[PDB]
């Protein structure tokens with residue numbers, strides 16, 4: 001699709017690597033460095049080929065033009081060396097072959113967020129080659145993610161954006177069939193565009209949570225005070241029909257666990273969808289349902305899963321989402337998961353390293369599966 005850092009010669013060149021070093025911080029110190037640990041090899045391969053390395057990154061959300069130490073990449077710069085912070089980097093920097101410097105937070109610059117042309121051209125001035133190695137940022141057009149690549153002598157993607165693209169697109173443009181997609185969450189309305197793209201691709205599709213509750217109500221079931229989006233019932237109904245004529249299996253919950261208050265404390269009751277009374281709510285799938293899911297995972301050649309299928313955070317309402325998680329683990333399909341809350345689940349059940357690929361990207365992960373990304377567009381345009 002586009003050019004890669006592996007296929008380009010970096011000997012003695014000025015190389016500008018955009019990374020996601022946007023780490024959490026507490027009163028001046030780093031609390032989680034997984035992003036640095038992930039970004040390291042890209043920086044090691046550049047140095048090993050004796051590039052003159054300029055490391056580019058964002059941190060928090062500062063006021064453009066207003067320097068504050070709170071959003072300084074200083075602690076990162078110390079933590080990188082252990083594995084200099086350059087401040088006035090736009091006017092130029094000498095960098096010897098084989099060493100690496102970290103430019104100060106790119107979001108300080110007047111014009112980053114608008115993808116200002118002038119700013120971008122100036123960034124492109126400062127380097128021979130630009131390496132977009134920041135998939136978690138690729139879904140927005142900003143001078144440091146999009147503009148710079150538009151006007152840089154030579155532009156390409158780094159190996160991380162490569163791993164992430166390989167995994168996502170592996171399971172979306174020639175999946176080992178059957179492909180199954182599990183999609184859960186609070187709202188149809190935040191995941192409808194994802195459902196649309198996957199519909200043209202999957203063999204089975206499974207909705208969970210709010211989403212499933214909306215679909216069950218579009219079908220005419222009663223679900224009491226369960227979370228649902230009434231305003232998307234027509235959308236859900238029409239999507240159900242589209243699935244039917246494409247022959248995409250779309251099994252809804254046949255049994256659920258309900259309670260009349262959401263807490264570790266109240267009566268959890270396993271029920272047929274028939275039997276949901278007027279002031280109960282659905283918080284999880286039942287055994288019959290999560291056995292149907294368990295079958296499709298076991299038979300799957302590929303799996304894509306975004307969103308827990310019950311209120312897994314409370315313990316009575318977690319059996320459904322664990323069951324599912326375990327099925328994807330034991331399963332032999334190439335599994336791909338993503339989402340803030342889904343990772344949280346995979347962490348709670350300590351099943352994270354059993355999925356073939358875990359995305360930590362959040363929004364860019366989601367927009368890609370929707371079939372929509374500015375960073376990627378330009379990297380190919382330049383490969384051409």
Ligand SMILES: Nc1ncnc2c1ncn2[C@@H]1O[C@H](COP(=O)(O)OP(=O)(O)O)[C@@H](O)[C@H]1O
Pocket residue numbers: 184185186187208209210213227282283284306307308309310311312313338339340341342343
């Ligand atoms: N039936 C339900 N009722 C209330 N909340 C739910 C229900 N199903 C799922 N949820 C909640 O929605 C969140 C998952 O939403 P979503 O953002 O789509 O997942 P992710 O962030 O993993 O992609 C979870 O935190 C979960 O507690």
Ligand SMILES: [Mg+2]
Pocket residue numbers: 283284285308309310311312317318319320321322
């Ligand atoms: Mg659950």
